[PDB]
Design a protein around this motif. Sequence first.
Motif, short mmCIF file in Angstrom:
data_model
loop_
_atom_site.label_atom_id
_atom_site.label_comp_id
_atom_site.label_asym_id
_atom_site.label_seq_id
_atom_site.Cartn_x
_atom_site.Cartn_y
_atom_site.Cartn_z
N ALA A 159 18.09 6.72 -11.17
CA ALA A 159 19.49 7.01 -10.87
C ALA A 159 19.60 8.35 -10.21
CB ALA A 159 20.32 6.98 -12.17
N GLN A 187 29.40 5.29 -12.41
CA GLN A 187 30.09 6.47 -12.92
C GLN A 187 29.45 6.85 -14.23
OE1 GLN A 187 34.32 5.84 -13.33
NE2 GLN A 187 34.64 5.89 -11.10
N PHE A 202 23.87 17.73 -9.25
CA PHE A 202 23.26 16.53 -8.70
C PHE A 202 22.65 15.76 -9.87
CE2 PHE A 202 19.68 14.18 -6.73
CZ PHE A 202 20.37 13.39 -5.83
N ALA A 203 23.29 14.65 -10.19
CA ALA A 203 22.90 13.84 -11.33
C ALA A 203 21.57 13.18 -11.04
CB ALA A 203 24.00 12.80 -11.60
N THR A 204 20.76 12.97 -12.08
CA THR A 204 19.49 12.25 -11.90
C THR A 204 19.18 11.40 -13.13
OG1 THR A 204 18.20 14.03 -12.91
CG2 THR A 204 18.46 14.23 -10.59
N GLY A 205 18.25 10.48 -12.96
CA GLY A 205 17.58 9.91 -14.10
C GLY A 205 16.60 10.96 -14.63
N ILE A 236 10.07 6.32 -15.80
CA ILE A 236 11.52 6.53 -15.80
C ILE A 236 12.03 6.12 -17.15
CG2 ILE A 236 13.68 5.86 -14.70
CD1 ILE A 236 12.14 5.36 -12.15
N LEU A 244 11.96 2.54 -18.80
CA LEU A 244 12.75 1.73 -17.88
C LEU A 244 11.89 1.20 -16.73
CD1 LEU A 244 15.13 0.57 -16.26
CD2 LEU A 244 16.17 2.84 -16.28
N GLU A 250 15.05 -4.11 -17.07
CA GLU A 250 16.47 -4.04 -16.76
C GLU A 250 17.26 -3.17 -17.75
OE1 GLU A 250 17.68 -5.31 -13.70
OE2 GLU A 250 15.50 -5.49 -13.50
N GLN A 251 16.60 -2.20 -18.37
CA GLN A 251 17.28 -1.29 -19.29
C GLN A 251 18.26 -0.34 -18.57
OE1 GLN A 251 14.52 0.17 -22.65
NE2 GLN A 251 13.09 -0.44 -21.07
N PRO A 301 19.64 3.51 -17.88
CA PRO A 301 18.89 4.77 -17.71
C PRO A 301 19.41 5.94 -18.52
CG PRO A 301 20.52 4.52 -15.93
CD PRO A 301 20.61 3.28 -16.79
N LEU A 313 20.38 9.69 -18.25
CA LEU A 313 20.87 10.45 -17.13
C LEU A 313 20.92 11.90 -17.51
CD1 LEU A 313 23.85 8.21 -15.95
CD2 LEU A 313 21.52 8.10 -15.18
N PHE A 372 22.87 15.52 -16.14
CA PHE A 372 23.93 16.00 -15.23
C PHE A 372 24.60 17.15 -15.90
CE2 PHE A 372 28.54 16.12 -14.19
CZ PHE A 372 28.44 16.44 -12.83
N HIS A 376 23.42 12.00 -20.35
CA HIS A 376 24.56 11.15 -20.11
C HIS A 376 24.10 9.72 -20.03
CE1 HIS A 376 27.92 13.98 -19.31
NE2 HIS A 376 26.99 14.79 -18.86
N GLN A 377 25.07 8.81 -20.01
CA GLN A 377 24.84 7.37 -19.81
C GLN A 377 25.71 6.85 -18.66
OE1 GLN A 377 25.52 5.29 -23.50
NE2 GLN A 377 23.65 6.15 -24.40
N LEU A 378 25.33 5.71 -18.08
CA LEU A 378 26.21 5.01 -17.13
C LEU A 378 27.42 4.43 -17.85
CD1 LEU A 378 23.84 2.69 -15.06
CD2 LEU A 378 24.79 4.91 -14.34
N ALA A 379 28.60 4.56 -17.23
CA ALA A 379 29.79 3.79 -17.64
C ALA A 379 29.47 2.30 -17.62
CB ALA A 379 30.96 4.08 -16.74
#
Lengths: 153, 153
Positions: A14, A150, B13-16, B70, B107, B137-138, B140, B142, B144, B149-152
């Motif tokens: 990501a 997001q 800049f967000a990343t995995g 990852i 991941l 398909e897990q 990620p 994150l 930031f 963080h996590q994905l919405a």
Amino acid sequence: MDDRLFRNAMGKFATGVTVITTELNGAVHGMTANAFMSVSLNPKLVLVSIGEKAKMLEKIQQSKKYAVNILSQDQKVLSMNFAGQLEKPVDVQFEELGGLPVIKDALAQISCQVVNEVQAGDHTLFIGEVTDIKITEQDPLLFFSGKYHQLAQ
Amino acid sequence: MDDRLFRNAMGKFATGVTVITTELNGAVHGMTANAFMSVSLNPKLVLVSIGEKAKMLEKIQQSKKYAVNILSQDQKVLSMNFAGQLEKPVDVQFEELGGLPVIKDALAQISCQVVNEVQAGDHTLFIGEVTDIKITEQDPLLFFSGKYHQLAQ
Ligand SMILES: Cc1cc2nc3c(=O)[nH]c(=O)nc-3n(C[C@H](O)[C@H](O)[C@H](O)COP(=O)(O)OP(=O)(O)OC[C@H]3O[C@@H](n4cnc5c(N)ncnc54)[C@H](O)[C@@H]3O)c2cc1C
Ligand SMILES: Cc1cc2nc3c(=O)[nH]c(=O)nc-3n(C[C@H](O)[C@H](O)[C@H](O)COP(=O)(O)OP(=O)(O)OC[C@H]3O[C@@H](n4cnc5c(N)ncnc54)[C@H](O)[C@@H]3O)c2cc1C
Ligand SMILES: NC(=O)c1ccc[n+]([C@@H]2O[C@H](COP(=O)([O-])OP(=O)(O)OC[C@H]3O[C@@H](n4cnc5c(N)ncnc54)[C@H](O)[C@@H]3O)[C@@H](O)[C@H]2O)c1
Ligand SMILES: NC(=O)c1ccc[n+]([C@@H]2O[C@H](COP(=O)([O-])OP(=O)(O)OC[C@H]3O[C@@H](n4cnc5c(N)ncnc54)[C@H](O)[C@@H]3O)[C@@H](O)[C@H]2O)c1
């Protein structure tokens, strides 16, 4: 191992989404990039990776500078625009930072002077020294598994 | 322009989150990294960026290989571990891919042979040719603005 398998894998990392901007003889050029990273603290270096066939490549080679515009959650249309995915270009609002055109209301703006250029397969890495920075507290546009996302709030 | 301003900016800049692994004499070494990116399609190239004072630097210089693991949402503890942030190391479950130690339940797992090494200020860029890939398909992990963080959803 296909090209699709590799792209799928890479898409598992990501990232935020940036637009790389530069100015060549009056004209502002921009390109959607997520192959960006922080490189060095002393000196302040940053890196972006540009495909060999990309119009932006020669533009940066000549101008010897670029800015990195980190996009907010509200800037999905700009990402698509600067990725060549819209039939008609949008009228983008530019401002200025360290002598570079930057995108108004970006999450963050980082202006650079190119200090090294390294070819790496399909692409060229432009290593840039940061001259100016502007930050906001907006939420980021994310890209993961080929889709826009997001942060969980 | 302080080091904190630059780090704050870069954090926008967000990343995995990955763990870079390698093997020297059967000993497995790992390091948390988010300065990772896809570089080239033909040939299949990837890049990681390692600090000049990091023990991993010399390890990779000798082994001439590395795997990128990852991390999933469920692997925050591993990220902290390989970042030197826990007082006691955790017992990490390794498996193998392309002759490299990789992290179980990552991941994604990407094994590489180093094909180039470029110094860039504070850091060295190790450009790697991908030999093997495993994907799941897990969701990620994150990173930031200095936080996990996590994905919405
Ligand atoms: C999320 C994502 C990440 C990507 N990451 C990378 C990467 O890191 N590296 C990489 O090489 N490619 C990346 N790409 C692909 C890249 O963005 C496209 O290939 C892009 O079209 C190439 O731009 P170009 O320089 O070849 O010029 P073009 O193909 O002409 O540029 C793309 C678009 O930008 C518009 N544009 C340019 N300047 C302006 C301006 N002044 N005002 C308004 N519109 C303007 C143009 O109308 C055009 O449609 C990514 C694409 C996506 C969607
Ligand atoms: C999210 C985030 C992103 C980061 N990104 C980068 C970056 O991209 N580039 C960069 O240079 N630094 C990065 N860092 C910093 C980096 O992770 C630390 O500086 C790290 O401690 C340096 O590792 P080292 O090679 O110097 O060895 P150490 O400091 O000794 O390694 C760190 C830890 O890994 C553990 N460990 C190593 N091998 C094993 C194993 N076999 N089994 C169990 N535990 C093991 C050790 O116990 C140690 O505590 C990042 C840190 C964070 C939190
Ligand atoms: N050059 C790049 O670093 C890069 C990155 C992302 C997207 N793109 C291009 O933009 C277009 C649209 O993207 P999409 O929606 O298909 O996303 P996608 O599913 O192809 O992208 C997922 C991931 O694959 C990797 N990737 C894709 N194309 C690459 C390339 N040419 N070189 C190195 N790595 C690459 C990137 O890490 C990206 O994050 C595609 O043509 C794609 O090739 C290029
Ligand atoms: N070397 C790196 O690319 C890198 C990246 C992230 C974190 N770290 C290190 O891990 C430790 C804990 O991290 P944190 O929680 O304070 O996150 P942080 O708030 O310092 O990290 C946010 C961002 O700042 C940038 N950054 C931080 N340190 C950097 C460095 N030494 N060189 C180049 N860019 C750097 C990275 O892009 C990172 O994503 C810190 O000591 C930090 O320096 C190093």
